[PDB]
Amino acid sequence: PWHHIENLDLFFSRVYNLHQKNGFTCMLIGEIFELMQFLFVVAFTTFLVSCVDYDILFANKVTLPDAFLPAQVCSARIQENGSLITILVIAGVFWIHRLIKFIYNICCYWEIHSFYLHALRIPMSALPYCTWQEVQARIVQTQKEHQICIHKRELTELDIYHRILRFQNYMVALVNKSLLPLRFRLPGLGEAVFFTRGLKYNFELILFWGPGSLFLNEWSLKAEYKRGGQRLELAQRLSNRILWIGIANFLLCPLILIWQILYAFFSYAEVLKREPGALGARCWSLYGRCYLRHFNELEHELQSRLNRGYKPASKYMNCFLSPLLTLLAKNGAFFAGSILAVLIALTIYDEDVLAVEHVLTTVTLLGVTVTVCRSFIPDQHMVFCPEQLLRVILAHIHYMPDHWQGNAHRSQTRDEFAQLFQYKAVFILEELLSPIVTPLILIFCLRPRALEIIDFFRNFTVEVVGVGDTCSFAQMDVRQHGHPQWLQTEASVYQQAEDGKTELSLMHFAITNPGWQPPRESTAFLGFLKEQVQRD
Amino acid sequence: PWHHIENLDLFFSRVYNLHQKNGFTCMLIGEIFELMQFLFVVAFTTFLVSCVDYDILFANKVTLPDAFLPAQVCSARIQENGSLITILVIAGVFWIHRLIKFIYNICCYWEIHSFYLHALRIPMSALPYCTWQEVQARIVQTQKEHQICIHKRELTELDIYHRILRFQNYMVALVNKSLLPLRFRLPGLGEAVFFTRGLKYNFELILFWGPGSLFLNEWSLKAEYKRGGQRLELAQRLSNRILWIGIANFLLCPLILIWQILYAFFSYAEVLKREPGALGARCWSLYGRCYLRHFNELEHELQSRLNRGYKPASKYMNCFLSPLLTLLAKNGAFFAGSILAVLIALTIYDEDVLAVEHVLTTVTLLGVTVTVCRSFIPDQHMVFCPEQLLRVILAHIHYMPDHWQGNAHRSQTRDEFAQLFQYKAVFILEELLSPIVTPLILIFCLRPRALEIIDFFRNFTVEVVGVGDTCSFAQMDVRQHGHPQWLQTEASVYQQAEDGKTELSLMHFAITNPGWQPPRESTAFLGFLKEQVQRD
Amino acid sequence: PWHHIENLDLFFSRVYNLHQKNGFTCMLIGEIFELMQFLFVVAFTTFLVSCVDYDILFANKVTLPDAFLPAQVCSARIQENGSLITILVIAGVFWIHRLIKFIYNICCYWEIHSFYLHALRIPMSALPYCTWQEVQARIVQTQKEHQICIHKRELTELDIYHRILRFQNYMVALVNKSLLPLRFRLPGLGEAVFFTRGLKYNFELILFWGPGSLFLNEWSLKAEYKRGGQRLELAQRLSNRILWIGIANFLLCPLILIWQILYAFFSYAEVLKREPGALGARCWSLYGRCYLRHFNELEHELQSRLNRGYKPASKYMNCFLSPLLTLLAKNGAFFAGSILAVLIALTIYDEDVLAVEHVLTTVTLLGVTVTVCRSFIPDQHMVFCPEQLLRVILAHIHYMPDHWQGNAHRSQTRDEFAQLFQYKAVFILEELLSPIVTPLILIFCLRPRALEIIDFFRNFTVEVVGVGDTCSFAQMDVRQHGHPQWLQTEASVYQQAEDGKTELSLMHFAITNPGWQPPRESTAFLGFLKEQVQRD
Numbered sequence A, B, C: 001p002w003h004h005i006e007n008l009d010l011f012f013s014r015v016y017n018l019h020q021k022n023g024f025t026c027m028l029i030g031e032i033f034e035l036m037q038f039l040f041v042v043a044f045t046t047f048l049v050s051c052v053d054y055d056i057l058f059a060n061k062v063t064l065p066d067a068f069l070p071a072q073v074c075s076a077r078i079q080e081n082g083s084l085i086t087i088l089v090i091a092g093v094f095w096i097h098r099l100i101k102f103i104y105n106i107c108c109y110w111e112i113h114s115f116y117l118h119a120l121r122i123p124m125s126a127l128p129y130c131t132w133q134e135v136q137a138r139i140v141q142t143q144k145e146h147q148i149c150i151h152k153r154e155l156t157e158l159d160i161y162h163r164i165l166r167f168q169n170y171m172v173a174l175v176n177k178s179l180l181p182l183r184f185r186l187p188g189l190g191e192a193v194f195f196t197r198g199l200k201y202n203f204e205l206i207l208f209w210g211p212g213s214l215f216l217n218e219w220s221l222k223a224e225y226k227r228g229g230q231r232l233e234l235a236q237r238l239s240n241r242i243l244w245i246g247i248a249n250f251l252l253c254p255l256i257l258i259w260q261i262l263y264a265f266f267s268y269a270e271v272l273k274r275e276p277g278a279l280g281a282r283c284w285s286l287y288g289r290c291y292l293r294h295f296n297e298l299e300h301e302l303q304s305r306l307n308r309g310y311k312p313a314s315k316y317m318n319c320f321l322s323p324l325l326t327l328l329a330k331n332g333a334f335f336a337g338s339i340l341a342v343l344i345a346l347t348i349y350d351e352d353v354l355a356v357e358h359v360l361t362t363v364t365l366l367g368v369t370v371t372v373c374r375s376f377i378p379d380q381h382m383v384f385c386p387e388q389l390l391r392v393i394l395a396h397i398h399y400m401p402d403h404w405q406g407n408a409h410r411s412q413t414r415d416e417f418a419q420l421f422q423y424k425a426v427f428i429l430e431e432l433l434s435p436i437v438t439p440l441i442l443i444f445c446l447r448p449r450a451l452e453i454i455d456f457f458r459n460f461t462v463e464v465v466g467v468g469d470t471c472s473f474a475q476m477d478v479r480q481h482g483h484p485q486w487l488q489t490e491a492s493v494y495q496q497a498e499d500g501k502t503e504l505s506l507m508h509f510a511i512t513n514p515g516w517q518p519p520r521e522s523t524a525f526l527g528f529l530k531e532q533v534q535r536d
Ligand SMILES: CCCCCCCCCCC(CCCCCCCCCC)(CO[C@H]1O[C@@H](CO)[C@H](O[C@@H]2O[C@@H](CO)[C@H](O)[C@@H](O)[C@@H]2O)[C@@H](O)[C@@H]1O)CO[C@H]1O[C@@H](CO)[C@H](O[C@@H]2O[C@@H](CO)[C@H](O)[C@@H](O)[C@@H]2O)[C@@H](O)[C@H]1O
Pocket: A042, A087, A090, A091, A094, A197, A198, A200, A201, A202, A245, A248, A249, A252, A255, A256, A258, A259, A260, A263
């Protein structure tokens, strides 16, 4: 609760994170569990590889520990493996770095916990039931007593938003203006979108937080990037920086590939054996979390919007069925159910139809076949309405390409709605492929864009008095960043928010935070909008 | 895409069918699968009857093909069966007729495929996502360039409807005016309705397409039926025709009975072993598909209406529970679950309670008993609302007897809503009974109505300039076929659409096809209706 | 259908009960089943205790009846048990009393059956589909012909309500004004509510129907309780009466405890073995059936309101999840699914991984663990809205504390909504604990309130001309029993309906029974309410 604290972006971010992971104790436990999962994957894997005698386990009454070798021998058997010892040393160094960051993080989170209890007065018991809106209103009222925000002003409830979301507004504006290569033209497929967790991590490590990034403070852009001249040498320097970060990625490829595979296998294989159709359900697509996101939108508001609108979207995606697969399913079900009905009537009649060379395996395989086909057979009496489903999905989601509203029922619309909605299986596949795909996209597809990235960060970076250097769009300025088709805008092409992000983002903010005082242009815009809504 | 083609009814029907079975390839495959199902049922059955040595299979390690007899012996064993060889010869003749019709059909469908691609310009890829409305608008715009409709006029979008649905409007009007015996008074039951697939096939074979039917062209009624005189000799001729068609049915009874038995056995026996309650779900009742159908309503519009309104109807049917069966279920569940809980506690305690003469079979039978009873026990906390359920079911369905709206909750209403909604099990039973029941209804209950059928076809058959001879009701003429209670109508009794079919059918058509230009009386009617709706 | 019958409260109650248990036959069967369940529990239990030779059954091919001992020995083995014979004699005396009451009840119900058939003219076939509203309208029209209601007036449709619900309105008003101890302050828990079936039975046996109750006739209060004086001696007499009834409860404690144990064991043990999560579903809480109930509300109207509003309430209760349990579930699922995926991959690879000392039991236990955790893991994409859920729950339920409407999302609101909504498991536990808890609450917590109970029954008991002595609140008088905050009321504190029961109860009655003629003040109140609703 200190006066003139430190970097305020971090303080506010930590406060927000403490509200999200409901309380200090919960958060501490969550982090500890996160550290134990890594160590368990690595140690379980190295135990399975190195200490277990599979031959005795398989064939050659045997108790479980009859397989395991004694530690006095496991240590020697794992030590005489240069590749394994090297992977373990790199894994242990990453782990120790993560454990040290965790200790430092909890030592800094006890300070936020004391902030809550003593200056906000929200006990950790009343924190899960507490409405981040109420939390930040407490903070804004506290700004008087326990002084913060070194010496600029009183907090204005959007400052906190800018502090928590400075780099995320930059990502939103980068992806919104089609920098940052995502679309690819694969042979044998349409234009794929490849945006993963590792790729966005690399983009942020290149642009925002690193040794030689664009930013020096975490709230101020380096002084040269604001200068119009010397843009070409800056572009060359950025290109070399991203080249070498891509090469580090290419060299770390084997280790991250191993991690993604062990790890994929340690959860999704269980789910596969249980319910193989859980991976046929669809998830909201990291590209799509960044596309459908308003500018100053905290994570919980985006996710509330995203799951309010999830079941409409599943009803839409299941409308759409291929006739050929449906017919193949129907008829395979007929023929398999016929042979199975005959074999079942026989095994019921005499009961010795069973234990005939292949009858039992045949019954089981035929049952699996009938079940798969019946899962592919659409439910008769299914209401097919892709227009109203798309209308309600939009009402929850707020952003959609413009060539969707008319032709809701075509393959073009369905095909690029799957850009946003994504079978979970292609998610797991796409997270597996990112170790081997991220370096080459990073080296080849982004380095040509470095001169456009430099011009973005020079052109769209405003200095706001209290917060520092923020994105130019996240101001929610209807002027200078509007879009003439949605709407007064003093914005030409290249200087405009594409899918209506400025207008819809300002509306979403004004609706979610009713306490905020809207500037002149924003107030006039919202008033004219309300007049048009109530009039028309 | 030819000029002055052929019979246009067939051309249009084929075009519509090609749109429905989404594309030529899909349709071809579907027909091939339809041909392979027949051949598989017959060949699998004759293999099970004739080639398999059940004794060795049952009792007397044995591989599966140890049962089968060698073909050099299967041929002789199937050939020395006069009944089997005769059934196989009749089956093979029906098959060859169906295969020849299939070859002719695909040779005629390649012409419709070329029509699409070259004159409509809708590739087979864009056809599943294509909206029959858009397809027929293409057709109506094409009528200028690739000339069709030999020489009468330009197409008016209702001509295509009449062409595709000429005989189906006749069936709708026949069933609507209570010709065509459907209601029967069985002893021990209420008035049953027996309308099947085979019965309607026989009605159409008698009336519409045959050697000596009412129609000579497929678009023109024979010349004598338009004459008022000689009605009695025509009635006698029709009565003799239907007598001999009924006798052909009675003679073919054994073969169609065998077909229905086998074919139901295969599929529904599999479903029975899987989920015996799937046959307790209810389907929309061939009588009911013809009762709830508007006049000029293509199959996909009826089915869209029928499944939009399916779940309300299931919620209605499950409201209604017999108290005696509910009480018997509750108490049988109590006593069975009590004995099973005791036996389960014992088998858990010692684990040797099992392998006691009858304990395991008792546990299994008691589990089945508890599950059946719990399925019959209504869900407590079930909202019982048969008035609003009937209101929404009507909103989807549009046609309901008039003595339903008040007493939605009685046994009279539920009992004759099951005329339309029909357990799937009574559907399979009613399709099994049709081989043995259709000849006797056809000989006894319809031959007395022949003089009324002749008067129907003489009185209600208009000659419309472009289309030929169509039903008089399907014109959707508010005059001369109205109903005074629904509504100006110059229609007395016997000359009126009963359940409001004219008014509601004209409204449904005007709503589904917004491009159609409504005649004077229809326009005035729809305008007055809109004024009354917006006023009241 | 007799003229000047008997006590009319009983006649009307019986008529209502006959309508509820749909018909005489159904009702008779239900009662017979109720008698057979008691006898079966007792006889099955005494057979399991006394006649079965568990040693031979467990260890020492054996047919089931090899366990049972011959009756010539079972009689002697059950007779030489003083405790068992005593429990059986008390059980048989209670049974014989119940059988005698059943015979008398059906001999009195044949009279109501003849009443229906001959004076109301509703056959038992048309009775399940018959709408108690229609039944009582028949009754009110019958009041002219088959004369009833000895000589006061014609029936006014609220008289029947008072007759059926005289003592239940008293319970509603007792619980509504916080007499009748329900809230308790347990250590280690919040303020528990303990209101069971046995406790309310004891309250009614003390107050309403007994040897020396408050009422002498069933429709008239004893003459002394109307007198202001002698209140202290009446309070002492009531205190002694409730002391001795509590002591009878304390002495009968072992037998009712045995009954509850057995009876819960049978049914809920079966359900436990089947679906252990059925006991995690929530039920509407005997306290809560009495709290949410309007004054003159028959049982079926309350239950219709209670299940119309059940699924909203379950959606509310499940949008509250503890973060710590959710995190523990997620991570236990991870670690268990990881070890199980490894063991499953091994058993798939070689198939002899199985039959290794503990692998199969480990796979089963791990599967149970993963399933339990996945049940505790909240469904991602779950819409969390406790404000609109509470709004719709209120719309169905009509009564709620006033400090709920604002903070729908807190632990205070959830914690005292579980007062009304109650896991089924705590219901079964709370019905088990009532034999041992009811005597001590009855002796200690209610005897101090006897002087307030006397003042309640003296102050709030009006003599209405046709019905006799009814509760003062159940008149639905907006004056003299209103509440100034809801609303003209001439009611001070202690003389007012707390949660708005008078106003909302009068509204519910006027809406459910549209035929009733509302008195002056009630009519003016309802009119002003309608004017305010349509105005604001
Ligand atoms: C110049 C060099 C550049 C090279 C850079 C490489 C970039 C890619 C590296 C990827 C990696 C390196 C680890 C490799 C280990 C090697 C050891 C050898 C192993 C041999 C045996 C770190 O990278 C992750 O780090 C995260 C931050 O830690 C980032 O998100 C930040 O996180 C927060 C901040 O605390 C804030 O929310 C915010 O700041 C960011 O959102 C991620 O964006 C990033 O992918 C892997 O860590 C990852 O593990 C995966 C599960 O595989 C985790 O999955 C997630 O959570 C699971 C449930 O828990 C679910 O299962 C899974 O569905 C879910 O998705 C990831 O979350 C991540 O933890």
